[PDB]
């Protein structure tokens, strides 16, 4: 009879998290991942956040951001329609946030909660990334929210960019991360090369690939306008510069 989130992650089992998830998500499936944590220091609060196995329908209105994360303050419900609690590109997250001090009434306290949540969720994505198979599932569902985050989040960009995934000349069937791309780059390669296009088919046989394939340089394939734009906002990854081959 004690709020699940107030319990230590160690004492909670799956199915307990699953049932609790069903209880708040209007979803029948178990969550893809569960991020239960607590924050201490200047501000104190607990939270259980979930990443759905699949992107919800959300085809009722024009907008979308209707984050139904239940907001509690010392175990007493307050609202499931909080504002600025979590970024718009992350609205797909479901769960509960229980704060010790009143989120008040913009408010400052709310901002530090939002900051910790973003930090924890990136932490959850890198975790899902440990299983390239379960990560594909997550990418198929929220690759759009990730790209959106890389575009909206300048302070967490580099980190989020580590979540992008693309096909390449050396990554045909399976997708690859920009980190693995870097690792694969030969000693004399200084740039991360890529090419933009309407589709994979249209980009796979570009004559611009010849000057690279012959020098055994891997090249990424971007087919989404958001990925393209994102790359100009990223510029560099891990130190390497992003270069569009079609240009030069
Ligand atoms: Mg089950």
Curated annotation (Swiss-Prot):
This is ATP-dependent molecular chaperone HSP82. Belongs to the heat shock protein 90 family. It is found in: Cytoplasm. The TPR repeat-binding motif mediates interaction with TPR repeat-containing proteins like the co-chaperones AHA1, CDC37, CNS1, CPR6, CPR7, HCH1, SBA1, SSE1 and STI1. CNS1, CPR6, CPR7 and STI1. Molecular chaperone that promotes the maturation, structural maintenance and proper regulation of specific target proteins involved in cell cycle control and signal transduction. Undergoes a functional cycle that is linked to its ATPase activity. The nucleotide-free form of the dimer is found in an open conformation in which the N-termini are not dimerized and the complex is ready for client protein binding. Homodimer. Interacts with the co-chaperones AHA1, CDC37, CNS1, CPR6, CPR7, HCH1, SBA1, SSE1 and STI1. CNS1, CPR6, CPR7 and STI1. Interacts directly with the substrates GCN2, HAP1 and STE11. The lineage of its organism: Eukaryota, Fungi, Dikarya, Ascomycota, Saccharomycotina. Induction: Expressed constitutively and induced by high temperatures dependent on transcription factor HSF1. According to PubMed:2674684, it is constitutively expressed at low levels, however, due to the specificity of the antibody, this result is unsure. Present with 444943 molecules/cell in log phase SD medium. The chain holds residues 273 to 527 of 709 of the full protein.
């Amino acid at each position: 009879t004690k709020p699940l989130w107030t319990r230590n992650p160690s004492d909670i089992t799956q199915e307990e998290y699953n049932a609790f998830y069903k209880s708040i998500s209007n979803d029948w499936e178990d969550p893809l991942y569960v991020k239960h944590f607590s924050v201490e220091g200047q501000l104190e609060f607990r939270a259980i956040l979930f990443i759905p196995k699949r992107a919800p329908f959300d085809l009722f209105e024009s907008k979308k951001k209707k984050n139904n994360i239940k907001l509690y303050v010392r175990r007493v419900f307050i609202t499931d329609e909080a504002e600025d609690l979590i970024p718009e590109w992350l609205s797909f997250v479901k769960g509960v946030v229980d704060s010790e001090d009143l989120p008040l009434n913009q408010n400052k306290i709310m901002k530090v909660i939002r900051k910790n949540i973003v930090k924890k969720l990136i932490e959850a994505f890198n975790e899902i990334a440990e299983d390239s198979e379960q990560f594909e599932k997550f990418y198929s569902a929220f690759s759009k929210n990730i790209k959106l985050g890389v575009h909206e989040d300048t302070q967490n960009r580099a980190a989020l960019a580590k979540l992008l995934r693309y096909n390449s000349t050396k990554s045909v069937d399976e997708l690859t991360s920009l980190t693995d791309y870097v690792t694969r780059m030969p000693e004399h390669q200084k740039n991360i090369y890529y090419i933009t296009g309407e589709s994979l088919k249209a980009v796979e046989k570009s004559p611009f690939l010849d000057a690279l394939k012959a020098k055994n340089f891997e090249v990424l394939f971007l087919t989404d306008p958001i990925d393209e734009y994102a790359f100009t906002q990223l510029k560099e990854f891990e130190g390497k510069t992003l270069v569009d081959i079609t240009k030069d």
